[PDB]
Amino acid sequence: MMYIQVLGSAAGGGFPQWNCNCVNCKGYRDGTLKATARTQSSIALSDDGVHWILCNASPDIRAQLQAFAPMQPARALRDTGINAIVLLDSQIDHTTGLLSLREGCPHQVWCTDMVHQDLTTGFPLFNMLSHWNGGLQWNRIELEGSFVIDACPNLKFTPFPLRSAAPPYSPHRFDPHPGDNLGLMVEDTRTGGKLFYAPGLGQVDEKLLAMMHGADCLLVDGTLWEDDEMQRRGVGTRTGREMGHLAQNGPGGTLEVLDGFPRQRKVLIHINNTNPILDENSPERAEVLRRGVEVAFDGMSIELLEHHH
């Protein structure tokens, strides 16, 4: 059994977003819209329900941990359910939460060489936190092969490369490198149960589709309904493909992709505050549910029991 806990299900900014008055955010604050607030994207993984691996450390991490009881097992005066953190990239929204964990150092942190470079230079979290009881202990994610975190010995992690898009602060934003961005396959080696985790997905190739077919649960980018959603709502000028996100709708959209995966569990995560699927009364949400696709929400629990083969 692999336990997957959705700590946060929104895109950057969360929902509602602090400075946003789009139809969704204003509607939420007004009480006129049936939607649930969401913190920024982050999941926790476990093979036993006691030892957890945090995937991405969001700026909302304090509220996220507090809302999920296994994060505080209370086995000692000081304690936490977090046994390791895996970073998929070096973006502020995926790393800032580490600052809020510094009272609990040392932490085992898994990330690529490229992300470690960013987090020792442009956003020098490793350097900063080294002054808190040894700080973050770097475990290198290699760009081929798999890894296993000791605390959850039955979870086998196999990262896969995504198009490189270093964050704006990065010394190499204008010079992208392999290892800037990855997605995760996670296997419970006791059952063969497999999670495909790609909260940021801007393109799909044949090899990607192949590896998805071997998965049991697909947890994938749900940022925008349409590629021009930001402009439609009047709160941004950047497009979906510009931000490295495939929209749900349209030719080559994620809903079209997911049509080829009837037997997988399918869940959208990393949902932007502008996305109508957040409206529980929207025809867009209705269409997602009609396609057998789920919309992640904070506190969602996914249990992977077994492999389909």
> Could you give the C-alpha distances from 31 to 22, 25, 36, 279, in angstroms and in order?
14, 10, 11, 12
How near is the Cβ of 29 to Zn ion at its closest, in Å?
10
How near is the Cβ of 292 to a second copy at its closest, in Å?
33
* CA neighbor of 219 nearest in space, from 197, 247, 203: 197
Where along the sequence are the contacts to a second copy (CB under 8 A)? 12-14, 16-22, 26, 29, 59-63, 65-66, 71-72, 74, 76-80, 92, 96, 99-104, 122-124, 127-129, 131-132, 168-169, 173, 233-235
Question: Which partner, a second copy, Zn ion, none, binds residue 102 by CB below 5 to 8 Å per kind?
Answer: a second copy
Q: Pattern 270-289, binding to Zn ion, x per CB under 5 A?
A: ---x----------------
How near is the Cβ of 76 to a second copy at its closest, in Å?
7
How near is the Cβ of 31 to a second copy at its closest, in Å?
12
Handedness of CA 253, 255, 256, 260 (dihedral sign): positive
How near is the Cβ of 102 to a second copy at its closest, in Å?
7
**Which residue, 16 or 179, is less far from Zn ion as judged by CB?**
16
**Which residue, 234 or 283, is less far from a second copy as judged by CB?**
234
For residue 260, count other CB atoms closer than 10 A to its CB: 10
**Which residue, 79 or 142, is less far from a second copy as judged by CB?**
79
Inter-residue contact 223 to 271 (CB < 8 Å): yes
Q: What is the full DSSP assignment across 160-208? A: EE------TT-TTTTS--TTS-EEEEEEETTT--EEEEESS-S---HHH
Listed ranges 79-87, 224-232, 254-262, 269-277: which one lies at the site for Zn ion (CB under 5 A): 269-277
Question: Which partner, Zn ion, a second copy, none, binds residue 77 by CB below 5 to 8 Å per kind?
Answer: a second copy
**Binding status of residue 2 toward Zn ion by CB under 5 A:** no
Which residues have CB under 8 Å from 207's CB, separation 6+?
Answer: none
Which residue blocks in 22-60 are alpha helix, DSSP H? 23-30
* Residue from the set 6, 7, 22, 82 that interacts with Zn ion by CB under 5 A: 22
For residue 295, what are the β-bridge partners? 268
**Which residue, 34 or 62, is less far from a second copy as judged by CB?**
62
How near is the Cβ of 169 to a second copy at its closest, in Å?
4
**Binding status of residue 20 toward Zn ion by CB under 5 A:** yes
**Which residue, 237 or 301, is less far from a second copy as judged by CB?**
237
Residue 158 has, within 13 A of its CA and on its CB side, a CA count of 14
Question: Which partner, Zn ion, a second copy, none, binds residue 65 by CB below 5 to 8 Å per kind?
Answer: a second copy
How near is the Cβ of 63 to a second copy at its closest, in Å?
6
How near is the Cβ of 59 to a second copy at its closest, in Å?
5
Inter-residue contact 44 to 71 (CB < 8 Å): yes
Inter-residue contact 98 to 129 (CB < 8 Å): yes
* 20 burial type by CB count under 10 A (0-12 exposed, 13-18 middle, 19+ buried): buried
Structure tokens at 176: 């992208």
Residues that bind Zn ion (CB under 5 A): 20, 22, 25, 273
